[PDB]
Design an enzyme around this catalytic site. Structure first.
Site, PDB file in Angstrom:
ATOM      1  N   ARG A  77      15.650  11.171  18.400  1.00  2.69           N
ATOM      2  CA  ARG A  77      15.072  10.608  19.677  1.00  2.69           C
ATOM      3  C   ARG A  77      16.327  10.190  20.655  1.00  2.69           C
ATOM      4  O   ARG A  77      16.938  10.969  21.701  1.00  2.69           O
ATOM      5  CB  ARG A  77      14.626   9.103  19.686  1.00  2.69           C
ATOM      6  N   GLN A 107       6.404  -5.960  31.744  1.00  6.50           N
ATOM      7  CA  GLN A 107       7.109  -6.205  33.161  1.00  6.50           C
ATOM      8  C   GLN A 107       8.309  -7.133  32.882  1.00  6.50           C
ATOM      9  O   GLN A 107       9.346  -7.005  33.097  1.00  6.50           O
ATOM     10  CB  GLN A 107       6.080  -6.966  34.094  1.00  6.50           C
ATOM     11  N   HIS A 158      12.392  -5.989  33.089  1.00  8.73           N
ATOM     12  CA  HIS A 158      13.018  -6.548  34.328  1.00  8.73           C
ATOM     13  C   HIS A 158      14.514  -7.257  34.116  1.00  8.73           C
ATOM     14  O   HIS A 158      14.846  -7.752  35.034  1.00  8.73           O
ATOM     15  CB  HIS A 158      11.923  -7.359  35.076  1.00  8.73           C
ATOM     16  N   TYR A 181       0.864   5.659  17.119  1.00 12.41           N
ATOM     17  CA  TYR A 181       1.116   6.154  15.544  1.00 12.41           C
ATOM     18  C   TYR A 181       0.861   5.344  14.749  1.00 12.41           C
ATOM     19  O   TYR A 181       0.461   4.291  14.984  1.00 12.41           O
ATOM     20  CB  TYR A 181       2.764   6.446  15.417  1.00 12.41           C
ATOM     21  N   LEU A 187       9.925   6.292  35.655  1.00 13.05           N
ATOM     22  CA  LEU A 187       9.108   6.532  34.600  1.00 13.05           C
ATOM     23  C   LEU A 187       8.412   5.081  34.230  1.00 13.05           C
ATOM     24  O   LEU A 187       7.300   5.477  33.563  1.00 13.05           O
ATOM     25  CB  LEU A 187       9.448   7.495  33.577  1.00 13.05           C
ATOM     26  N   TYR A 188       8.907   4.342  34.458  1.00 12.84           N
ATOM     27  CA  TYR A 188       8.537   2.915  34.114  1.00 12.84           C
ATOM     28  C   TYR A 188       7.777   2.158  35.024  1.00 12.84           C
ATOM     29  O   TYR A 188       7.454   0.935  34.661  1.00 12.84           O
ATOM     30  CB  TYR A 188       9.818   2.289  33.210  1.00 12.84           C
ATOM     31  N   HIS A 230       2.528   0.381  37.274  1.00  8.67           N
ATOM     32  CA  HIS A 230       1.674  -0.367  38.328  1.00  8.67           C
ATOM     33  C   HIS A 230       0.317  -0.042  37.759  1.00  8.67           C
ATOM     34  O   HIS A 230      -0.671  -0.899  38.096  1.00  8.67           O
ATOM     35  CB  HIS A 230       1.855  -0.062  39.580  1.00  8.67           C
ATOM     36  N   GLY A 288      10.594   8.802  28.425  1.00 10.21           N
ATOM     37  CA  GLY A 288      10.832   7.443  27.878  1.00 10.21           C
ATOM     38  C   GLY A 288      11.077   6.991  26.679  1.00 10.21           C
ATOM     39  O   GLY A 288      12.021   6.228  26.395  1.00 10.21           O
ATOM     40  N   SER A 332      14.402   4.404  25.763  1.00  8.76           N
ATOM     41  CA  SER A 332      13.889   3.173  25.091  1.00  8.76           C
ATOM     42  C   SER A 332      14.727   2.729  23.872  1.00  8.76           C
ATOM     43  O   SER A 332      14.823   1.735  23.604  1.00  8.76           O
ATOM     44  CB  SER A 332      12.489   2.913  25.024  1.00  8.76           C
TER      45      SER A 332
HETATM   46  C1  HEM Z   1       1.301  -8.404  39.358  1.00 13.71           C
HETATM   47  C2  HEM Z   1       2.735  -7.782  39.250  1.00 13.71           C
HETATM   48  C3  HEM Z   1       3.277  -6.703  39.747  1.00 13.71           C
HETATM   49  C4  HEM Z   1       3.690  -6.518  40.931  1.00 13.71           C
HETATM   50  C5  HEM Z   1       2.978  -7.303  42.217  1.00 13.71           C
HETATM   51  C6  HEM Z   1       4.677  -5.577  41.123  1.00 13.71           C
HETATM   52  C7  HEM Z   1       5.474  -5.163  42.326  1.00 13.71           C
HETATM   53  C8  HEM Z   1       6.430  -4.271  42.299  1.00 13.71           C
HETATM   54  C9  HEM Z   1       7.318  -4.230  43.373  1.00 13.71           C
HETATM   55  C10 HEM Z   1       6.959  -4.543  44.796  1.00 13.71           C
HETATM   56  C11 HEM Z   1       8.303  -3.395  42.994  1.00 13.71           C
HETATM   57  C12 HEM Z   1       9.516  -2.713  43.974  1.00 13.71           C
HETATM   58  C13 HEM Z   1       9.141  -1.633  44.714  1.00 13.71           C
HETATM   59  C14 HEM Z   1      10.262  -0.789  45.398  1.00 13.71           C
HETATM   60  O1  HEM Z   1      10.930   0.000  45.097  1.00 13.71           O
HETATM   61  O2  HEM Z   1      10.294  -1.270  46.674  1.00 13.71           O
HETATM   62  C15 HEM Z   1       8.247  -3.081  41.683  1.00 13.71           C
HETATM   63  C16 HEM Z   1       9.127  -2.665  40.837  1.00 13.71           C
HETATM   64  C17 HEM Z   1       8.973  -2.115  39.597  1.00 13.71           C
HETATM   65  N1  HEM Z   1       7.681  -2.531  38.752  1.00 13.71           N
HETATM   66 FE1  HEM Z   1       6.497  -3.585  39.342  1.00 13.71          FE
HETATM   67  N2  HEM Z   1       4.830  -4.966  39.930  1.00 13.71           N
HETATM   68  C18 HEM Z   1       4.060  -5.803  39.122  1.00 13.71           C
HETATM   69  C19 HEM Z   1       4.025  -5.494  37.639  1.00 13.71           C
HETATM   70  C20 HEM Z   1       4.627  -4.580  37.127  1.00 13.71           C
HETATM   71  C21 HEM Z   1       4.303  -4.123  35.742  1.00 13.71           C
HETATM   72  C22 HEM Z   1       3.261  -5.077  34.806  1.00 13.71           C
HETATM   73  C23 HEM Z   1       5.105  -3.392  35.296  1.00 13.71           C
HETATM   74  C24 HEM Z   1       5.198  -2.737  33.930  1.00 13.71           C
HETATM   75  C25 HEM Z   1       6.569  -2.330  33.283  1.00 13.71           C
HETATM   76  C26 HEM Z   1       5.862  -3.023  36.437  1.00 13.71           C
HETATM   77  C27 HEM Z   1       7.072  -2.322  36.389  1.00 13.71           C
HETATM   78  C28 HEM Z   1       7.821  -2.114  37.561  1.00 13.71           C
HETATM   79  C29 HEM Z   1       9.356  -1.380  37.496  1.00 13.71           C
HETATM   80  C30 HEM Z   1       9.984  -0.954  36.186  1.00 13.71           C
HETATM   81  C31 HEM Z   1       9.867  -1.567  38.634  1.00 13.71           C
HETATM   82  C32 HEM Z   1      11.350  -1.289  39.105  1.00 13.71           C
HETATM   83  C33 HEM Z   1      12.225  -2.426  38.852  1.00 13.71           C
HETATM   84  C34 HEM Z   1      13.637  -2.346  39.579  1.00 13.71           C
HETATM   85  O3  HEM Z   1      13.949  -0.837  39.845  1.00 13.71           O
HETATM   86  O4  HEM Z   1      13.882  -3.077  40.435  1.00 13.71           O
HETATM   87  N3  HEM Z   1       5.682  -3.761  37.576  1.00 13.71           N
HETATM   88  N4  HEM Z   1       7.107  -3.726  41.235  1.00 13.71           N
HETATM   89  C1  LIG Z   2       8.955   5.504  18.796  1.00 12.83           C
HETATM   90  C2  LIG Z   2       8.090   6.407  19.459  1.00 12.83           C
HETATM   91  C3  LIG Z   2       8.528   7.800  19.567  1.00 12.83           C
HETATM   92  O1  LIG Z   2       9.555   7.904  19.791  1.00 12.83           O
HETATM   93  O2  LIG Z   2       7.736   8.777  19.085  1.00 12.83           O
HETATM   94  C4  LIG Z   2       8.260   5.915  20.974  1.00 12.83           C
HETATM   95  C5  LIG Z   2       9.346   5.532  21.462  1.00 12.83           C
HETATM   96  C6  LIG Z   2       9.388   4.958  23.078  1.00 12.83           C
HETATM   97  C7  LIG Z   2       8.144   5.268  23.722  1.00 12.83           C
HETATM   98  C8  LIG Z   2       7.952   5.231  25.165  1.00 12.83           C
HETATM   99  C9  LIG Z   2       7.351   6.102  26.164  1.00 12.83           C
HETATM  100  C10 LIG Z   2       7.437   6.027  27.535  1.00 12.83           C
HETATM  101  C11 LIG Z   2       7.908   4.601  27.924  1.00 12.83           C
HETATM  102  C12 LIG Z   2       8.519   3.545  27.083  1.00 12.83           C
HETATM  103  C13 LIG Z   2       8.298   3.892  25.688  1.00 12.83           C
HETATM  104  C14 LIG Z   2       6.905   5.973  23.004  1.00 12.83           C
HETATM  105  F1  LIG Z   2       5.961   6.255  23.891  1.00 12.83           F
HETATM  106  C15 LIG Z   2       6.912   6.167  21.873  1.00 12.83           C
END
Ligand code: HEM
Ligand SMILES: C[C@H](C(=O)O)c1ccc(-c2ccccc2)c(F)c1
Ligand code: HEM
Ligand SMILES: C[C@H](C(=O)O)c1ccc(-c2ccccc2)c(F)c1
Ligand SMILES: *[C@@H]1O[C@H](CO)[C@@H](O)[C@H](O)[C@H]1NC(C)=O
Ligand SMILES: *[C@@H]1O[C@H](CO)[C@@H](O)[C@H](O)[C@H]1NC(C)=O
Ligand SMILES: *[C@@H]1O[C@H](CO)[C@@H](O)[C@H](O)[C@H]1NC(C)=O
Ligand SMILES: *[C@@H]1O[C@H](CO)[C@@H](O)[C@H](O)[C@H]1NC(C)=O
Ligand SMILES: *[C@@H]1O[C@H](CO)[C@@H](O)[C@H](O)[C@H]1NC(C)=O
Ligand SMILES: *[C@@H]1O[C@H](CO)[C@@H](O)[C@H](O)[C@H]1NC(C)=O
Lengths: 552, 552
Positions: free
Chosen positions: B89, B172, B176, B324, B353-354, B357, B495, B499
């Site tokens: 990986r 989240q 974060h 798995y 990719l993460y 939403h 991912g 990761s």
């Molecule tokens: C109710 C909760 C949630 C709200 C309202 C929310 C809202 C948002 C907003 C407004 C952004 C920024 C958008 C922009 O690029 O302008 C964001 C970014 C992001 N959210 Fe969510 N989100 C929520 C839940 C989640 C969950 C559960 C995940 C799962 C991993 C997630 C992952 C992400 C990621 C990875 C980013 C990028 C972070 C960054 O680059 O700062 N969000 N989200």
């Molecule tokens: C350990 C396992 C693997 O490499 O097969 C593995 C590892 C990481 C992920 C992964 C895929 C997408 C977002 C975040 C994590 C996944 F889906 C599966």
């Protein structure tokens, strides 16, 4: 009161206090078990009874020239040897880093905070009774006494190895990109957050600086033509912050990059040679890439110049320094099949062991003159006065003092030498012996074993009373040099591991970086692969002055 | 006009322009030669004709439960497998890092500047004709159209794998700490200069912050008792800068550490669980170390908590996620005999990719209630209203949406989804296919191959016209999921490599760190080695609510 004050854990095991007046040793992977990681595991036994000593090893490397001349011509073997020196040396440095002035324990603060120089050995607990832990007296001997009795220079002792003022000043310039104490924070804190050969002393530590020192044309660094020679631009034109005594007439306040290189013409000589070099490559690159723009020309040259630097540093600087007959080799591929961390954190012990002030002669003899420290300092008019060619000629022909051996610190920089002593103390260092051990060396049984003579040894014994309390900096300078060498075992054995990790733990050496295109093609890759100090000077100095780090 | 716009170099070879309308591929170590690093070397041929595909591999990992139950019980084999998933990986990630928003070429600026997220693939030259290089039309299809046509949610599609709101919110909170775009610089710039699992979202990104959130007693984090429960202290008391809507009555403006965690009660639920956890370890450590002080207690717990996090993330989070049957294992020693860089730079592609939403349901059902996004947001009174135990219960029992598959993005966060589309574009990304290839995947021959169905595929083809122009973010959400899985090949295959590198390339995993004393002894080392999400909740939540990342 800390039960680990006695530094009880041997063979690199870690001491953890489990009580108040009780401790414990984490002998993990040390190769030894038992209360203090002392009882070797069987396999350890084997390795131990088969590993020569730094001196026998040094001997072979220093003798048998003929054999070596054969070895140096059989590529496989050479790569075979270099690969080993490269790996074995490196395994002596904690990477990822651990410990610093404030942390005698791993901690995330210690790891993540890049403002601290790392530590090869942890500091001493503040509640330990004696300043070296448990051994010795309530206070170390007065640094002024130590300084005068065994450090200060009487008669200039030239270095038997041959080091000239080209080597001396290169060592200053080179190490000064990474050794940059933030005296506002305290010793133990650095300003070279790039922790290695990043060439910030040419380009500036920050983007704003770099940007002010830059021309923005063909990828070149800003400059000026004085006489007919190319020199760094002014502080008034570029506006970069340089450190200069209030009486420099402006117009001589050169810019350069490392804010302190205006303080000594020897630094500015090199600082100018490298500016010249950067520009030269911009031209070479621009010829290959009519399509490139100012940034890619800049960014690519900086990569090449970092390559040249690492090449010259191993195959000329360290080669000379080593005294070895084996042809050291800068070849990244050597570690492509080895476990090796391409990262580095400069340790304060490398800063301290690297204060090679006993290299500075009493006068700087620039052909037809012999300036005093008082006249050399901050005087770039001398530089403009003689001008690189006859500077490389002068300095090529001028031995430097011996570092090890004792009593060779110019009384002019005695303030700096005492400072090294005082700081190591406030930084709660460990004895020379703890360090020697940490680096697989055998601790000195007597001050006389340390020195290899009797008068200084004697003066030390009066002062420190216990060899196991002798401090690292002083002992490095007051130490029996190897044969007709400049330093002794301790200096070569601690510094070597440090110097090689920072050089080889540079990203350009990583499999992803080490490829032609990284440098602008197969042409820029030659620049790196054919670099020498002689080439650096030939290409940028007026008449191709012959050079060397060795005085004839 | 850049001759590399066409992205001509295959098998990971680098494109260097050597002319204006001429280029060249640096097929170094790619395993292929020929103009575009296409013609495989003989050995490559062997490997290729012997390496299963992500789906056949996935198949085995997903089927044969019984066989796996045997393999999971034979330590050697399990370590043997994990070691290989861990190594294979990881070899897909450039470490040391290369490329960023501004640099399509290696550069020292790219390498040293920690303010940029790195790049798995270089951006697209600004002077390329079409926004994906050379292929496609002058402009990509209108993001709004793409959003509405194949992204927006009609009827909530629950995840067949089982993900609940415990999983959803952990992902989240966890991600974060590292995903923290500095929207003042632009996407492509991060504020988590720790580039990984450093737990800054608990402790603060900076020493000042950390220090304000700290109690300075027994190594504990500041806090307050409300009802009888332990919650983060206020912004008023601590003075840390948190992001809260101007109408929060104070007293509900919790402090915490990650400045944006007050914006959603699911984040604050975890943020409070971890605060509790830290304190708990302080107690455990203090019992073991009556001699320790506030700092060593703090710094050590932080290291333990970072351990637990990496333990839970691989053996529970990724375990669930993977589908798995093989029992993933967090064991640092697996890489002690392998070449592996213990460092990490978060890539923007991982950020993009993460954006999961499509996991958010339409209402947050906290037992006896079903809050709307509008009532859940910034509402920590709900948290104080129900209180962790009945929150872990509610959320444990609540499926989350499916990520892959299409049309499952809550119209409530459609603004965020469009943004993901917009930013990837402004960051000059490459097509889903370029990315698929970079990750050893077979490029999609049709939109229908991508989706595994026809209406969306059809809508995509109308919109993008060429599969080879299909963008990375949209295609990740509008992609055929594996069987009853949450994501498809691309999401798992890109991912995954990312990761695992960030998780295993953490200093606590390095040979020098991975040892009992690092954690305060063999006791704190257990804390890390016996960590589970169930234990995390049991120990810090009122009645040991049963938990899981899977809805029953
Ligand atoms: C109710 C909760 C949630 C709200 C309202 C929310 C809202 C948002 C907003 C407004 C952004 C920024 C958008 C922009 O690029 O302008 C964001 C970014 C992001 N959210 Fe969510 N989100 C929520 C839940 C989640 C969950 C559960 C995940 C799962 C991993 C997630 C992952 C992400 C990621 C990875 C980013 C990028 C972070 C960054 O680059 O700062 N969000 N989200
Ligand atoms: C350990 C396992 C693997 O490499 O097969 C593995 C590892 C990481 C992920 C992964 C895929 C997408 C977002 C975040 C994590 C996944 F889906 C599966
Ligand atoms: C004429 C030239 C030289 C002068 C006047 C000089 C002067 C000084 C001074 C004043 C300091 C700072 C003292 C303090 O307050 O801590 C210093 C530090 C240092 N010097 Fe020199 N030095 C010279 C040559 C050298 C040489 C040739 C070397 C060889 C490597 C050297 C290596 C060092 C090192 C490693 C430091 C520490 C750097 C840092 O931490 O910032 N010096 N020197
Ligand atoms: C290559 C050779 C070796 O490892 O034996 C070698 C490498 C580095 C050093 C060295 C020692 C002290 C300061 C700077 C460099 C040295 F003295 C010798
Ligand atoms: C271990 O070290 C301690 C402290 O230096 C010493 O008192 C003790 O006797 C040693 N024990 C052994 C077995 O080496
Ligand atoms: C580095 O850490 C020390 C103590 O933790 C602190 O004094 C110094 O300000 C820190 N610097 C930064 C930038 O965090
Ligand atoms: C600086 O150099 C000049 C010319 O080389 C010399 O004459 C003068 O003495 C030096 N300055 C000082 C203050 O000594
Ligand atoms: C290499 O790539 C270019 C650009 O995509 C293509 O036109 C050329 O024909 C390819 N040549 C070979 C030998 O693959
Ligand atoms: C990082 O690089 C970009 C451009 O080179 C710049 O905008 C940003 O400020 C840099 N940050 C630092 C700390 O150098
Ligand atoms: C926040 O949630 C609480 C408890 O669930 C609810 O009573 C309240 O109406 C919400 N806050 C606002 C401003 O609506």
């Amino acid at each position: 009161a800390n039960p680990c004050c006695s530094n009880p854990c041997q063979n690199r095991g870690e001491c953890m206090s489990t009580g108040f007046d009780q401790y414990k040793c984490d002998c993990t992977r040390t190769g030894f078990y038992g209360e203090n990681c002392t009882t070797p595991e069987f396999l350890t036994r084997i390795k131990l009874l088969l590993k020569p000593t730094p001196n026998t090893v040094h001997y072979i490397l220093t003798h048998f020239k003929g054999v070596w001349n054969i070895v140096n011509n059989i590529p496989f073997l050479r790569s075979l040897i270099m690969k080993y020196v490269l790996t074995s040396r490196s395994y002596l440095i904690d990477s990822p880093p651990t410990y610093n002035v404030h942390y005698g324990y791993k901690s995330w603060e210690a790891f993540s905070n890049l403002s601290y120089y790392t530590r090869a050995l942890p500091p001493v607990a503040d509640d330990c009774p004696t300043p070296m832990g448990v051994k010795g007296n309530k206070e170390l001997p007065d640094s002024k006494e130590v300084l005068e009795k065994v450090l200060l220079r009487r008669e200039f002792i030239p270095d038997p190895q041959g080091s000239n003022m080209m080597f001396a000043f290169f060592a200053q310039h080179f190490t000064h990109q990474f050794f940059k104490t933030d005296h506002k924070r305290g010793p133990g804190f650095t300003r070279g957050l790039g922790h290695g050969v990043d060439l910030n002393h040419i380009y500036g530590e920050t983007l704003d600086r770099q940007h002010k020192l830059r021309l923005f044309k063909d990828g070149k660094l800003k400059y000026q033509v004085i006489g007919g020679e190319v020199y760094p631009p002014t502080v008034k034109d570029t506006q970069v912050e340089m450190i200069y005594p209030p009486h420099i007439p402006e117009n001589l306040q050169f810019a350069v990059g490392q804010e302190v290189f205006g303080l000594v013409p020897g630094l500015m000589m090199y600082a100018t040679i490298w500016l010249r070099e950067h520009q030269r490559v911009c031209d070479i690159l621009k010829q290959e890439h009519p399509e490139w723009g100012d940034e890619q020309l800049f960014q690519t040259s900086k990569l090449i110049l970092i390559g040249e630097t690492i090449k010259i540093v191993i195959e000329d600087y360290v080669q000379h320094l080593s005294g070895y007959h084996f042809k050291l080799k800068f070849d990244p591929e050597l570690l492509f099949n080895q476990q090796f961390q391409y990262q580095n954190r400069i340790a304060s012990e490398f800063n301290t062991l690297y204060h090679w002030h006993p290299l500075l002669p009493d006068t700087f003899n620039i052909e037809d003159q012999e300036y005093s420290f008082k006249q050399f300092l901050y005087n770039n008019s001398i530089l403009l006065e003689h001008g690189l060619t006859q500077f490389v000629e002068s300095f090529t022909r001028q031995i430097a003092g011996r570092v090890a051996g004792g009593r060779n610190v110019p009384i002019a920089v005695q303030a700096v030498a005492k400072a090294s002593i005082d700081q190591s103390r406030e930084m709660k260092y460990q004895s020379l012996n703890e360090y020697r051990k940490r680096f697989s060396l055998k601790p000195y049984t007597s001050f006389e074993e340390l020195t290899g003579e009797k008068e200084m040894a004697a003066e030390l014994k009066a002062l420190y009373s216990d060899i196991d309390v002798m401090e690292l900096y002083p002992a490095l300078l007051v130490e029996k040099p190897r044969p007709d060498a400049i330093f002794g075992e301790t200096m070569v054995e601690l510094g070597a591991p440090f110097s090689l990790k920072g050089l080889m733990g540079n990203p350009i050496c990583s499999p992803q970086y080490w490829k032609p295109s990284t440098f602008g093609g197969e042409v820029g890759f030659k620049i790196i692969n054919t670099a020498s100090i002689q080439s650096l000077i030939c290409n940028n100095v007026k008449g191709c002055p012959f050079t060397s780090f060795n005085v004839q």
